[PDB]
Amino acid sequence: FGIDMNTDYTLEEVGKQFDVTRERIRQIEAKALRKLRHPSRSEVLRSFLDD
Amino acid sequence: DPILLRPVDDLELTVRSANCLKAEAIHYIGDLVQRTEVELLKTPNLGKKSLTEIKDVLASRGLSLGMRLENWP
DNA sequence: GCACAAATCCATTGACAAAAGAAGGCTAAAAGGGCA
DNA sequence: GCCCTTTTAGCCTTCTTTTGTCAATGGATTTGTGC
């Protein structure tokens, strides 16, 4: 994503920065979003959603 | 109490932990806090690691082992 | 304390499906001119 | 004013690509467990 950084790169650029292939990057980001979806990591973000 | 009435994937521990919970029918924290060291230890493929991480996480939430339930549901 | 016995986290590999561009044809405005 | 005409801008669907998506698979540690 574009968080605290310049242009958000695609999967291949993230892989070249991590020397890993794109599918590992997708698995890692999905892992992190799963980890963030539960409360204790979601209560504070979710209050930003008035929907 | 709200802490004992949440899912087993509530406190976000090891995947082996949740697998063993569903393998001993553990799905709610209400009786998960009902289980003591031996009762939890008896299970398959749940050795020191998973139960002791349960211990650490509930200690961070402060609760203890084997609390005797009434008003459940 | 030791030694085996799966459960399972880092990475491919293929096969694919859906944006994203790049383009080529059609509409379709839209200058622009010319007999008085 | 009147059409004729010539033109060009813009949308409008195909095709080629880039990028993401999904399923499987060693194999390494690791955790569990019997001794």
Q: Which residue of A has its CA nearest to B8?
A: A38
Radius of gyration of chain A (CA): 14
Cα separation, B16 vs B50, whole angstroms:
7
Q: CA separation (Å) from A2 to A6, A34, A46, B17?
A: 6, 19, 19, 35
CA B11 to chain CA centroid, Å, is 10
Protein CA at A15 to nucleotide C1' at D23, angstroms: 21
- CA-wise closest residue to A38 among B20, B8, B46: B8
CATH architecture, range B1-73: Orthogonal Bundle (1.10)
Closest CA to B42 of B25, B64, B59: B25
Query: Is A43 among the annotated ligand-binding positions?
Result: yes
| Residues in a beta bridge with B28 | B7
Domain ranges within chain B, ordered by starting residue:
1-73
Among the listed residues B33, B41, B37, the one whose alpha carbon sits nearest the alpha carbon of residue B6? B33
- Ramachandran bin of A19, using left for φ above 0, alpha for ψ from -120 to 50, beta for the remaining angles: left
Q: Coil, strand, or helix at residue B42?
A: coil
Method used to obtain the model: cryo-EM
User: Would the Cβ of B43 be found within 7 angstroms of any atom in strand C?
Assistant: no
